[PDB]
C-alpha cells in the first residue's frame, strides 16, 4: 500500500498521478513564522484547493509533493489541501538544496535514521508517513550530497519506498547519481531521475531508461519564452518550449521505453525560496497550473499519434508501479 | 513594560538578568521534525528546567533567549520551560548565521516587516512577542548581513526594542556594525556589541563604550581562561563604564547546529551551565574588590534599562 497524507491507499486508488509537484516551495518553519508573505495561510490554502480541484476535474487523482523538510514541507498544509480538494497527496522525506546546519552537519548514519523516522514513524508529531525520498544535487555531487544519496538508498532498501532526484544548474546529473545508488545496491526501478526534460540529450536519457531508471519528464510547462527581459524567470524556467519538453516523452516512447517515463508539471501554489512574487510570474506562464499535463500535454501527444493506452500507461500504470513499496 | 514568553512584565520584575542565552541552538522546525536528536522533546525540557532552576537558585530571574527563527527558536518550548522554572524568558527576532533561502532572498524592507511582525504581532500563532532583535555577522559584513543590520535598526526605531549583535570569526567587528547602525539613526544605547570578551583589545572596547554602546561580555565560560575574560569587566568598570556592561554565559541546553554531542563537550567544560555567571564570575569580581552595588548595577540595572522599550 502507498502512504498518503490521508493515510494508506491501494494501488488501484492512485489513478492519474503527477509525480513531481509541491503545494508550497519554502523553508522549514517559514510558512508558520511569516504566513503573510503568502498573503495569509488561508489564502494559500484557498489557492491550492482551487488549483488542485481544477487538476482533479481534468482527471488528476494523486500528486506527489516532493517537498522536504528544508523546502518547507508543512504536512498539515498538505493534509488540509488534500482533503478539501479530495486529491491524494504523497509526502516526501529527503534533503533539497538548502539544508540548515542541523541537517548538513549530520552523518550518513544520522541522515538514514531521519529518513526512516519520516517513512516508518511519521513526520513531526502527525503520524503522517512519507511515501517517497527526494534528493537534489548540484552539477558535481558535493560530499554532503553524496551522504544524502547514500542515506536515501539505505532508507529505500529498508522500506521499499522510492527515491526521486534532480540536479540543479546542470542539464545532466543522472549518471553520477546512479553510480552512487548502485554502489549501495539500490535497484534502478526504485529511482526517478527527475527534471530530465531539462536536456535534449536523447542518448543520455535512453541509456538511463535502458538500465531501468524512471525518467522524470516533469517540468513540462516551465518556459520563459516571451519573458526574456526577466532574468530570474529565464534562470528558473529555461528557454525551451513546453512542446520541446513534451516531445521527449514521444522520443522515449518511440525508442521502446514507455514504461520508464513519469510526467509532471513541477508546479506549486506559493514560493518563498526564490525572488519575491515569482508565483505571479509562473502563473502568467501557465494559468492551467497542475492541470497543464492532462489538459494540454496529453492532447498534444495524442495529436502527434501516441495511442491513448500508452498515455494511460505513463500517467497511471508507471507511477503506481513506482510508488508501490517494493 | 518588557514582553516575555509569558506576557508583559514590569521593570521591577525583571531582576538579575542574563542577557545572551539560549534554551536550544538548532534550526527552524528541527526540534519538531527530529526531537529524537535531543533524546526527546521531554528530555530537553527536563534538562532546561533543571538548568534554569539552578540559575534561579543562584539569583537569576530573567534570561534573554537570543535564538532567532534560523537558530531554531521554538517559543512554545521557551514558554513551557519559563513556566516550569519560574524564570522569565525574553524571546528574540532577527537573523543568525544560517538563514534559509526564504530569509536570505529577502530585501531590507521585507526583513524589516518580518522583524516588526515578530515584535508587534507575535511569533508564529502564539501571540508571544519578541523583546529583542539579534543579528550575527561574519568578519567582513556581507551584503546580506548589512541588510539585516539595517532592518534591525529600522525595527528598533519603530518599536524601541534593543538590538544585540556579534561577529563570528573575529575578535573585533563592532566598528563595522556601529557605522551601519548610526547611518540609520539608531542610538548606540539601543545596541549591545556582544561576544566582546573574545578580544583583549581594551582600547577597542572602551572606545565603543564611550560612544554609548553596551558591551556584551557574554561568552565568559567558553574559554575552553575565563578569569582573563572576566577581568575585562573590572577593567571597563575602572574606565568608568559600569553602566555600559552586560554579562552572560551564551549557554544552552541542547545544540544541533554543530557536531553531534557537542552539548556533552560544552557541559564537561562548564558544568555550572547558566549558573556560571552568578556562581563563579560574581564571586571572582567581588574578591577583586568590585562593590556589591556595582555588581547589582551590571546584573540588574543595566539589563532593565537596555530591555525597556525606549524610542
Ligand atoms: Cl524540488
Ligand atoms: Cl546567537
Author numbering:
A (entry chain B): 36 to 361
B (entry chain A): 36 to 259, 276 to 362
Task: Copy text verbatim from the article accompanying this structure deposition.
Phosphotriesterase (PTE), a binuclear Zn(II) metalloenzyme from Pseudomonas diminuta, has previously undergone directed evolution to change its activity from a phosphotriesterase to an esterase of 2-naphthyl hexanoate (2NH); the round 18 variant (PTE-R18) in this engineering pathway had an additional Zn(II)-binding site within the active site, indicating a loss of specificity for two divalent metals. PTE-R18 was generated from PTE by the mutations H254R, D233E, F306I, I274S, T172I, S269T, M138I, T199I, L272M, A80V, S111R, A204G, L130V, L271F, A49V, K77E, L140M and I313F. Given that PTE is naturally promiscuous for divalent metal coordination, combined with this additional loss of specificity for binding two cations, it was hypothesized that PTE-R18 could have the potential to bind unusual metals in its active site. Ln(III) ions were an interesting candidate, as their larger size compared with Zn(II) ions could result in mononuclear occupancy of the unusual ‘third’ binding site in PTE-R18.
The strong chelating agent 1,10-phenanthroline was used to remove the co-purified and tightly bound Zn(II) ions to permit lanthanide binding in the active site of PTE-R18. However, in the 9.5 keV structure an anomalous signal visible to 6σ was present in the active site; this signal was not present in the 13 keV structure above noise. The anomalous signal was suggested to be a result of the Cl K edge (2.8 keV) and thus was modelled as a chloride in both structures given the proximity to Lys169 and the abundance of NaCl in the sample from the purification buffers. However, in the apo structure Lys169 is decarboxylated and thus is capable of adopting two conformations. In both structures residues 260–275 of chain A were unable to be modelled due to a lack of electron density, whereas in chain B these residues were modelled into clear density. Previous directed evolution of wild-type PTE into PTE-R18 resulted in stabilization of loop 7, and loop 7 was able to be built into both chains A and B of Zn-PTE-R18 crystal structures. This suggests that the removal of Zn(II) resulted in increased mobility of loop 7, which was observed in chain A of the crystal structure, but loop 7 of chain B was rigidified by stabilizing crystal contacts and was able to be modelled.
